[PDB]
Design an enzyme around this catalytic site. Sequence first.
Site, PDB file in Angstrom:
ATOM      1  N   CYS B  96       0.872  -1.168   0.000  1.00 15.48           N
ATOM      2  CA  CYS B  96       0.000   0.000   0.000  1.00 15.48           C
ATOM      3  C   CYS B  96       0.910   1.220   0.000  1.00 15.48           C
ATOM      4  O   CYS B  96       1.379   1.649   1.053  1.00 15.48           O
ATOM      5  CB  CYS B  96      -0.932   0.033   1.215  1.00 15.48           C
ATOM      6  N   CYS B  99      -0.353   4.231   2.257  1.00 15.56           N
ATOM      7  CA  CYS B  99      -0.528   4.054   3.715  1.00 15.56           C
ATOM      8  C   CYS B  99      -0.124   2.672   4.208  1.00 15.56           C
ATOM      9  O   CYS B  99       1.053   2.452   4.556  1.00 15.56           O
ATOM     10  CB  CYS B  99      -1.941   4.447   4.197  1.00 15.56           C
ATOM     11  N   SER B 100      -1.063   1.729   4.277  1.00 10.93           N
ATOM     12  CA  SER B 100      -0.704   0.422   4.831  1.00 10.93           C
ATOM     13  C   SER B 100      -1.709  -0.665   4.483  1.00 10.93           C
ATOM     14  O   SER B 100      -1.607  -1.799   4.991  1.00 10.93           O
ATOM     15  CB  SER B 100      -0.554   0.506   6.348  1.00 10.93           C
ATOM     16  N   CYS B 101      -2.653  -0.323   3.609  1.00 12.19           N
ATOM     17  CA  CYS B 101      -3.745  -1.216   3.248  1.00 12.19           C
ATOM     18  C   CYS B 101      -3.300  -2.672   3.085  1.00 12.19           C
ATOM     19  O   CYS B 101      -2.379  -2.984   2.316  1.00 12.19           O
ATOM     20  CB  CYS B 101      -4.498  -0.690   2.023  1.00 12.19           C
TER      21      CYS B 101
HETATM   22 FE   LIG Z   1      -2.937   1.597   3.381  1.00 12.41          FE
END
Ligand SMILES: [Fe+3]
Lengths: 211, 191
Positions: B96, B99-101
Site C-alpha cells: 500500500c 498508507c498500509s492497506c
Molecule cells: Fe494503506
Amino acid sequence: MDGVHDLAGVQGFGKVPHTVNADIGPTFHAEWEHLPYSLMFAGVAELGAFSVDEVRYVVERMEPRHYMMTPYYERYVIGVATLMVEKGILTQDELESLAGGPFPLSRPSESEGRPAPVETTTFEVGQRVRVRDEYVPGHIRMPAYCRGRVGTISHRTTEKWPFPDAIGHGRNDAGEEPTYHVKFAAEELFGSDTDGGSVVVDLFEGYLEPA
Amino acid sequence: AQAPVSDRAWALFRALDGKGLVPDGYVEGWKKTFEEDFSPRRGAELVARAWTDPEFRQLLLTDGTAAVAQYGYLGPQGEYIVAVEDTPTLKNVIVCSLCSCTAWPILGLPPTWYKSFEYRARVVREPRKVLSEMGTEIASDIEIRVYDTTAETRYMVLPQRPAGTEGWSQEQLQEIVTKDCLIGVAIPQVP
Ligand SMILES: [Fe+3]
Ligand SMILES: [Mg+2]
Ligand SMILES: [Mg+2]
Ligand SMILES: [Mg+2]
C-alpha cells in the site's frame, strides 16, 4: 493531495528493515498501540462521526515534516484526535490537559473535496484506459505515478463504494462507483528507470477515461 | 514539541471514554481481535486448501470473497478479497504505497516493515532489487507484478507450491506458507 505520503517512486530511501520470514515481534510493541485503530472504529462504527476515508485524509494532512518523523501508529493517534477535534467531539485543550503536554494535530484541510463525477464510463476487462490527467488538492486514491498514464483493465469490481474524494471530506455527494484493477507496464510509469514488470493500481471509475 | 506518545494515546482514550463514547470492553475487544483472530495462519489455510483442491483453487481465484467467506474469514479491511496467482513466469507482490492497506483478517495486521517509507517508496519501482535485498531472488525470466492497494480490494498472493511437498497434508503445507509468502515478498520453502 500531492503530499509527502504519496511515496511510490520516490528515490533515496535505504533498505527495507526486514529480511524474509524474520521475527516481526508481537502485533503491538507498546501497550497503547491498539488504541488508534480501536478508536478509529469507535469513531466510524459506533459514533458515525467520520469515515475511514476521512482517517486516511487527516493523516495525509499532517504537516509534512511531522508526517516524515512520526512512526506509523502515532500518525493514527494524531489523525483520530484531529478528527475528534474537527468534528467538535473533543477539544485540543482537553487532549493536552490529559496528555500533560503538547498534542499538535494535523493541519486544516485546504480543500472542500469534490463530488463523485456524474459522467464516467463502465469499462470491461482487456480494455485500455488512461488515468485522468487531473490535479486534486483534497483526498484522492490515485498515486501520482499513474496520473495521465495508460494501462489495461484486468478486473472490474462486483461491488461499489463511495468516491474517496468526497467521502474523505465527509461530503454527502460521494455516490458509489466500482473500482478497476488497471495493469501498467513498469516502463509506462518509470521509463527505463525500474526493474519491475507490471504494476496494478486499483482505481475508482471516476479516475479513468477511455484511452 | 510533543508529550510522550503513550500519554497522547491514553489521553485520546480517556477523553473519549470519559464522555461515554467508548463502550465497555471496546478497545480490549479490538485488541483481542487484532492479536488473536486476524492471523496469517488463516491465509496459510486458504493457500493449503487451494494447493490440494483444484475446485477451491478455482473459486479462490475467480471469487476470492466467496472463497474466504466459506472459511468465515471476511472481516474489517478484508471484505472484498482478490487472490493473485504466482506462476512459473510471474511473481506477485502487494503493497500500500499510500498508507498500509492490507487484508487484515487473513494476513494479520501489517508489519512495521510493510508500512515503512522504504517499502512504500521502493517496491513499486524496483521490486526486484527490494525482494533481493530481503532475501528473495527473482530471476529475469520472471515478470514481477506489484499490486498497489489503493482502494477496497484486499489482496493475498497464492504462491507456487514448491517441489518436495507432494502428498503433504493441508496442515503440513500450512506450515510453510508464511505471512511474507502471503504478501508476496517470500517464496514458500521446504523446511
Ligand atoms: Fe494503506
Ligand atoms: Mg508527489
Ligand atoms: Mg503438484
Ligand atoms: Mg503424509
